Design an enzyme around this catalytic site. Structure first.
Site, mmCIF file in Angstrom:
data_model
loop_
_atom_site.group_PDB
_atom_site.id
_atom_site.type_symbol
_atom_site.label_atom_id
_atom_site.label_comp_id
_atom_site.label_asym_id
_atom_site.label_seq_id
_atom_site.Cartn_x
_atom_site.Cartn_y
_atom_site.Cartn_z
ATOM 1 C CD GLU A 1 -3.045 -0.844 0.056
ATOM 2 O OE1 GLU A 1 -2.938 0.122 -0.733
ATOM 3 O OE2 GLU A 1 -3.940 -1.708 -0.057
ATOM 4 C CG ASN B 1 -8.785 6.210 -4.674
ATOM 5 O OD1 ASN B 1 -9.153 6.396 -3.514
ATOM 6 N ND2 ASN B 1 -7.730 5.469 -4.979
ATOM 7 C CG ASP C 1 -13.374 7.024 -6.395
ATOM 8 O OD1 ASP C 1 -12.687 7.758 -5.643
ATOM 9 O OD2 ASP C 1 -13.319 5.776 -6.345
ATOM 10 C CB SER D 1 -12.148 8.754 -2.443
ATOM 11 O OG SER D 1 -11.655 7.623 -3.137
ATOM 12 C CG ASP E 1 -6.649 5.013 -1.265
ATOM 13 O OD1 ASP E 1 -7.835 5.222 -0.956
ATOM 14 O OD2 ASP E 1 -6.324 4.167 -2.120
ATOM 15 C CG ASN F 1 -11.020 5.636 -0.342
ATOM 16 O OD1 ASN F 1 -12.214 5.898 -0.384
ATOM 17 N ND2 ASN F 1 -10.171 6.003 -1.297
ATOM 18 C CG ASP G 1 -17.297 -2.432 6.854
ATOM 19 O OD1 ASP G 1 -18.151 -1.972 7.644
ATOM 20 O OD2 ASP G 1 -17.383 -2.305 5.614
#
Length: 129
Positions: free
Chosen positions: A35, A46, A48, A50, A52, A59, A101
């Site tokens: 990562e 990202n 979209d 967002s 990280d 994120n 989650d």
């Protein structure tokens, strides 16, 4: 801060991540390797919109607030900047929420693609832990 491999393993263990939700320390070190290359200041945008953040590239869509991700949540209740600290407490505490989650560490696509099913113990081999 760019952690050493064993240094990060020790910090992760210190903050209770070793075998958290059944995921051995090597899994966490492996995920952090791919990562962020162990760099707490890592950020990546990202497609979209967002972003990280940090050693585990958490994120902004769901987990932290950066004020520039429309429609997002802040489920770890932290500014995303907290995930960039030399102190990994915020990243670890937030990662515990993420891995709980539902899909475990598959939440980290890089873990699924580069760590899952591999000899992850290699990542903590030799480390005084």
């Amino acid at each position: 801060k760019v952690f050493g491999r064993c240094e990060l393993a020790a910090a992760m263990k210190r903050h209770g991540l070793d075998n958290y939700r059944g995921y051995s320390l090597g899994n966490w070190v492996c995920a952090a390797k791919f990562e962020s290359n162990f760099n707490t200041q890592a950020t990546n945008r990202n497609t979209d919109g967002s972003t990280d953040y940090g050693i585990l590239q958490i994120n902004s869509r769901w987990w932290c607030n950066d004020g520039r991700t429309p429609g997002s949540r802040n489920l770890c209740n932290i500014p995303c900047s907290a995930l960039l600290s030399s102190d990994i407490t915020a990243s670890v505490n937030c990662a515990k929420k993420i891995v709980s989650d539902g899909n475990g560490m598959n939440a980290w696509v890089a873990w699924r693609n580069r760590c899952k099913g591999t000899d992850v113990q290699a990542w903590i081999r030799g480390c005084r832990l």
